[PDB]
Nucleic acid binder design. Sequence first.
RNA 1: CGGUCCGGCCGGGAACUCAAAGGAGACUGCCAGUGAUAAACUGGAGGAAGGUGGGGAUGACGUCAAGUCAUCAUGGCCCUUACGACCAGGGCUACACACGUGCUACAAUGGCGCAUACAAAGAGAAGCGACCUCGCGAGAGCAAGCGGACCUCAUAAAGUGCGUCGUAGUCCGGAUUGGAGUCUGCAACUCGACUCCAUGAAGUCGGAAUCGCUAGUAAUCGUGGAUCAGAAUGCCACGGUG
Lengths: 100, 99, 151, 86, 112, 127
Amino acid sequence: AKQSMKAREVKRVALADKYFAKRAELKAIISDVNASDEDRWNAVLKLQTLPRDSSPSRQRNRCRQTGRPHGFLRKFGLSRIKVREAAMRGEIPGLKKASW
Amino acid sequence: RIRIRLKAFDHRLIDQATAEIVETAKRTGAQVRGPIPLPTRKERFTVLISPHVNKDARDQYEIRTHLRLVDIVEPTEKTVDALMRLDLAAGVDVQISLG
Amino acid sequence: PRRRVIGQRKILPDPKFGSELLAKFVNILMVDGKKSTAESIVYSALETLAQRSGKSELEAFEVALENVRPTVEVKSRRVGGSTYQVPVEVRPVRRNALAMRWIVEAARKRGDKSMALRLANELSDAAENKGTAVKKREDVHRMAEANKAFA
Amino acid sequence: PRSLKKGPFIDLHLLKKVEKAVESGDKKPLRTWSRRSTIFPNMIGLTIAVHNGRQHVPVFVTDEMVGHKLGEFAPTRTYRGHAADK
Amino acid sequence: ARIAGINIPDHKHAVIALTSIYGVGKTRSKAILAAAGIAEDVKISELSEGQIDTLRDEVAKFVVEGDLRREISMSIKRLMDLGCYRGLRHRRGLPVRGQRTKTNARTRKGPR
Amino acid sequence: NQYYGTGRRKSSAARVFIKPGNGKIVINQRSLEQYFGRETARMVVRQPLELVDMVEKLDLYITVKGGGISGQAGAIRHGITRALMEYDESLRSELRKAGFVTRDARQVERKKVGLRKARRRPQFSKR
RNA sequence: CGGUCCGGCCGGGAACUCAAAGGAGACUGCCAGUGAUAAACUGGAGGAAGGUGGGGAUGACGUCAAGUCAUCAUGGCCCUUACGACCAGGGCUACACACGUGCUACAAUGGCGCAUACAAAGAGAAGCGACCUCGCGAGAGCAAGCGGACCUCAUAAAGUGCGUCGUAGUCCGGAUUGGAGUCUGCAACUCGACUCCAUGAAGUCGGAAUCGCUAGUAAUCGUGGAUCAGAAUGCCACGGUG
């Protein structure tokens, strides 16, 4: 991928982890039905106050080694090409050709 | 009372581990119920190995995980000393359950 | 097809009666692998037309089927737009299958109360040489003599 | 549609503009890039120059539109004629 | 039976009889019968005038025929009066939800 | 101490015990009228018994699991065939002639990659 | 075998269904015929198996300046106040069409209302999520258990039982459209899906010319899983019937 794109991922994840404490304890008020609409509205408007890419939903899953949005495996953490290369070279334990 | 679970990618590294643990339990204690296997799990992956437009070049990869279980043979204090030893060769995950 | 001369796979033993021809007929009739519904429908039509005729069930089915089992068909082993048609006498193995296929094709042509009633009329009139399968067979037989220059 | 638990959704900077427009002196249109902000009765009468991608288009807000997004009254792409309408 | 200005044949069941009315459908066709004390099995034949008027009043309780039709027409025209994106898509006639209109949507449009 | 025979057809396991009791049938805490749906299964789970005289001569306490209706029927048929073979040692020839000893090894084929089914391929683009 | 809360409930029983390790096992081995005194072929006593038992992986020398310099690397060429760097709103999902690959179907082999069995393979830790209660509903408060042969996803459908629909603008098709919501997401107007009510487009078996399949295969039914905050009629695999 691009250097700017890769830096965007770390910049988003850092601010998402830093503000994770506020996001959960702020959406808790919204989720709590037993609350006043005056505090519900305040919580709703205060959540849009923090910077946008501060949520886990606003980040992608580019592969660590190279960087590729389309094509990824959560268990392996790399794109399809890199996963195949690692499997063929033996870097992934207990991974062989499936044939049933 | 206590049980030991072994997860392995290959059976070669887990059969010898089971043999070692049962011989240690025979040296310290007796009345073994034998290592019982559990249904292994096979996680599949489909990887299209073509780095561009070709939805015909696919590879099927498999991760196998085999489970072994060893129960109590003689619950005492000396039998735990010989089982809390250093970990075995890398590749075998050992879980200790007590109750 | 080219070097292999296949045999033949065994058919169901036909638990109700034991007729391999009946098993072939129900296998031709059934679609989408839904054996239960097709077998129920064919058994109901089986009973209805047998009790409408009066004679024995299978003994009437055989005489109604042999009366529209064709003898000679027409084929064309020609390539191109121009075609020459040659008559070929059907072997007994394919004769019953073709007759059953014609019967089941003609069955789904009447707007009766149910599929069993659709089957029953065109299955019973075959004994008296009436219906649609017999109507098409008496023209298939004429196709052979329509142009029998090459045989 | 959005769940009624969270209620209507508007921009934070939008509330300040709406308050300033009603208190006091509205002569210039309210310029907002936000289109997801729901319309409120406070904005009735006031001019909203809503951005659609090229340039802010003026929208005159009436009581008819309340439970609709402000971006609905803002075409995204210009249409003149498919058969080369010159 | 003259129910809410419509005629119903005597060879059908009550469920489809109510369904034939514009604005009753299937669930209301059972709710009305349950409220009036009629099972969703009887036919239009052998229907007393008391049951007829109870069904008519139950139908009149909720919305109706051409009244509801012009009911809906006004609601549709409200979007065009607003002039929103939905109103413009209604004016064009192609979509109103925003499906793939460019390649294949032959449902609200058509040639001669 | 009564021996028995085991039977499988596609993915179903059925084991049936043989005892001198005359014609007591219960299929996994059920009966033929319970595990039913078509007469074909009932006929096929009694063919070794209906062969010569064993229709009402020894009871059938089978319990069967897995597969479908036809798979369970085939598994029960193979199990009773093996049980009768082990019980008598002379009905094996008749069962081989009837085709009951030969277990049907046919199972569902795997789905290939690029194909919509095991062998069905996507339609060619009009070329 | 014993008791029962009749339930594997647990004492107990390690034969079995099954779990996953090592072996035996099908090797033209044999018996006849055929053939050139061979190779090899045809039938069969045995076997779960017969000529590769049934499937998958394994894809030569090479052809197509075949496709990717936008996974990545790399030789020149191009910009360094801009083809580089940051942010907000729109577009990839679009007004007259054509083409390709799939799905719903066309109906009495069927949808409808109420009981009722039969599977396998996989997922689960800021995740799967039992039960109770509100719900006509997607779901909501409560949440135990579960790093998982234990607990969930997840009474599989087809079918099977009974009525009902009688060849019909149909109790057929659920495409369009209006009203009000439910879940996830700072935020579904451009742009997800589910849920209710109503509305009920076509269609009524398709012209030339065409596509795949020879056995648990073609059809027909349901389910799981990949990336994923949510989004399959696609993809990848299990199965039921066949």
